[PDB]
Design a protein around this ligand. Structure first.
Ligand code: HEM
Ligand code: HEM
Lengths: 450, 440
């Protein structure tokens, strides 16, 4: 029953590390997985981790009684500015449970329609921007999606307006965030040239915290019942204390980052797949048209864009924008009845590979067909993990899906899209996935919003 | 006969060391304060005579004796504006031609066609200000320029510059600004030939766009329109000069006007109260209707007084058609140049009284009581501003919505600093706006 774990061989003392010398490490890992199978050990100096690609093993990895969320080296680098926020704290860190309990009601389905109006504000800003384009012009999809998602999390979460649509370049916070996370992902592979880039990592951390100070200072000046309000007032009395200021600043950074990037990616990929599959686009457009009948979409009409939701879930299947998460083995145990694991050992869920499991999805894994999600309960458990797992799963999942569904819905409702460049897919990696350089032309239906 | 007053001369330099400045009109205003209603000004190779009194200017505005002159500035603008309406001689074929062809485009029939689009850009402005955080403030002439440029773009050529989707000025604006810093640099090679590149980015984009698709706007008349005297066309070359012309002339001065108007309103709180009251009482529709804009009488008066104190097109030039005598005192030979120094004119105490520096819109309660040729911010005669009603309509609509939707605050106690670039603007002018929170 015991077996030997597959591994790409070493580069002497660098071990396996020089293989992730690329703009696209996750995709490279995807081919390694295609070659070596459901599981392979990957060694870097001082670090060992095991990549899982099959549902059979991952369903085991998701047993919370045997495995807990691990802070990967990447997450440990992000913690330099995310601190002990929800995303970068250990499960058994006190402030994790404290902040989890305090912030969880802010992601109840109650709060979601407190958020709805504010979501509609930003969505309308996007629609208006596209309506106002001249014929020559085209849409830079992931850029505008980023504008929308960041403004949305800013407004709903902290009553703060980034005003991303009043800028033809990315917002300063965005530039600094992307630079601080591509930098962290650069540290994944201490020399002095790296002194100098550390100086730039401190500067972009500074810039993100200037903004945070603007959100706090703005909150001083006015009455809100949003995420920030719960962070200041909210109380967990298992602990009996409010989140102290430092942690609140970490949570603000955390939610600003996590609460926009992956969703921007998701919307981007979804539009891409829609224009690459014209019929799916027609069907989705039909649903959007039949359902979104109010000048601005109410909430409850957003909830039966079921086919839109399925489209988004399929987009998440093929290219999960948060493409991986790490776990550690609590105690000595055996995985899959074949691979023995010592306490502390790391596992990495290679999510796109998992989602390409032919054992689960059939042989047509590479094709885009949303109807896979017609009967969700047929899908084996732990087979679909775009939002992580268990008690450490994405708290903003409902937020992301509602926003994405609302926006994609209004998009399909208000515009016809055209792949005027016959765009060739090119995926950029920055701990998250995005279709870089993706552009389209949109010709308006001319339905007003009022 | 009498001898014409003149500032001291410095040998070959003549009067030139007296205009060593970034702000010539204001310096000339001081010179006028010193020498009175008329003075000759000599620079090497150039002589012009500056007029400041209504008495003399009403004579200067006699079209049978004086015609529009292209000052050196206008002559340099002519390098990219060519023989468009603003930079062509009256006796050039294309002036009368294009004037006849384009004149109906600024009748009131066309004017309420424009209203909806004006409201479009205006709403974009209001929305921008509604969406500012508490930290933030407004850069007034920058946003006014965004709005005026977008408005003339949409109304004129059905093209959206989308200036409010940029946190920086549109490329055309920057290029234009050094196209006129150019005019006075002449007092950079082909990076000015380059600002010509970009201004015709603009032009080629607008032509190709009109090509690509029911519009009947300025561009439409430029294309179809024809001259009932000659029956001859604006040739393509001239059409592009006219497009440039209307984009330039049709935005900067209006932006300036709105800027100065807001400035004077925040420096004079009671006037702000009355104007705001009119705006609130009249603008009752979610978006302002056409004829309600026409009932913003006090806002119109505010704008007129702002033009009185600082006319954004602050001067214009004339030449003597034939030998003649001016004011029965100063003989002029054919070709001699005159300059109407408009702000001084608007500060003539024989006309407006002794408190000329005060901002009082109520001066314009009865516009027809005001003597003629006393108020000339839009030039004179057949060479007067063709875009006058357009500018005033936009400005009234916009100022009205501004007063209706916001309370304004001079949070820096801004000290007026007027920048001159063929036009006037209050540079660095900033305010804070607190929303009344009235929806649109
Ligand atoms: C397409 C959209 C999104 C995707 C694909 C996504 C994906 C994920 C994944 C995979 C994790 C697990 C990370 C790990 O286990 O290491 C996670 C956690 C998390 N996500 Fe998201 N997410 C999305 C949207 C959002 C939004 C909109 C928010 C906030 C408004 C958010 C906030 C969070 C937080 C706070 C955690 C960690 C919570 C905890 O550990 O207590 N996410 N997400
Ligand atoms: C407050 C706003 C404005 C002011 C103060 C202003 C001022 C003037 C002045 C002083 C002249 C005469 C120039 C000279 O005699 O050398 C003029 C002419 C002209 N203006 Fe305006 N202007 C304004 C707005 C506009 C607008 C909005 C447009 C177009 C949409 C426009 C287009 C023109 C044109 C084409 C001429 C040349 C007239 C001709 O020779 O047929 N202006 N303007």
């Amino acid at each position: 029953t015991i077996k030997e774990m597959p591994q790409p061989k070493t580069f002497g003392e660098l071990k396996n590390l020089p293989l992730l010398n690329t703009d696209k490490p996750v995709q490279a890992l995807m081919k390694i997985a295609d070659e070596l199978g459901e599981i392979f050990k990957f060694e870097a100096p001082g670090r060992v981790t095991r990549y899982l690609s099959s549902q059979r093993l991952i369903k085991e990895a998701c047993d919370e009684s045997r495995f807990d969320k691990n802070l990967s080296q990447a997450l440990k680098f992000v913690r330099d500015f995310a601190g002990d926020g929800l995303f970068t704290s250990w499960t058994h860190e006190k402030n994790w449970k404290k902040a989890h309990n305090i912030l969880l009601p802010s992601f109840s389905q109650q709060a979601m329609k407190g958020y709805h109006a504010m979501m509609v504000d930003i969505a309308v800003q996007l629609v208006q921007k596209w309506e106002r384009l001249n014929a020559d012009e085209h849409i830079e999809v992931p850029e505008d999606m980023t504008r929308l998602t960041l403004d949305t999390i800013g407004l709903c979460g902290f009553n703060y307006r980034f005003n991303s649509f009043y800028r033809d370049q990315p917002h300063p916070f965005i530039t600094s965030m992307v630079r601080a996370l591509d930098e962290a992902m650069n540290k994944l592979q201490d020399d002095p040239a790296y002194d100098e880039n550390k100086r730039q990592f401190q500067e972009d951390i500074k810039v993100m915290n200037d903004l945070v100070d603007k959100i706090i200072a703005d909150r001083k000046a006015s009455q809100s019942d949003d995420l920030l309000t719960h962070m200041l007032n909210g109380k967990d009395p298992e602990t009996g204390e409010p989140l102290d200021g430092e942690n609140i600043r970490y949570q603000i950074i955390t939610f600003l980052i996590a609460g926009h990037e992956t969703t921007s990616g998701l919307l981007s990929f979804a539009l891409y797949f829609l224009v690459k599959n014209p019929h799916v686009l027609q069907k989705a457009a039909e649903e959007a048209a039949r359902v979104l009948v109010d000048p601005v979409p109410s909430y409850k009409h957003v909830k039966q864009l079921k086919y839109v939701g399925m489209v988004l879930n399929e987009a998440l299947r093929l290219w999960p924008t948060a493409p991986a998460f790490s776990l550690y083995a609590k105690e000595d145990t055996v995985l899959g009845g074949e691979y023995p694991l010592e306490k502390g050992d790391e596992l990495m869920v290679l999510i796109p590979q998992l989602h390409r499991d032919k054992t689960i999805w059939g042989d047509d894994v590479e094709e885009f067909r949303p109807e896979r999600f017609e009967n969700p309960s047929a899908i084996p458990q732990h087979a679909f993990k775009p939002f992580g797992n268990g008690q450490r799963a994405c708290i903003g999942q409902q937020f992301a899906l509602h926003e994405a569904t609302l926006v994609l819905g209004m998009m399909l409702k208000h515009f016809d899209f055209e792949d005027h460049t016959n765009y060739e897919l090119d995926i950029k990696e920055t701990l998250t996935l995005k279709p870089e350089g993706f552009v389209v032309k949109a010709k308006s239906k001319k339905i007003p919003l009022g």
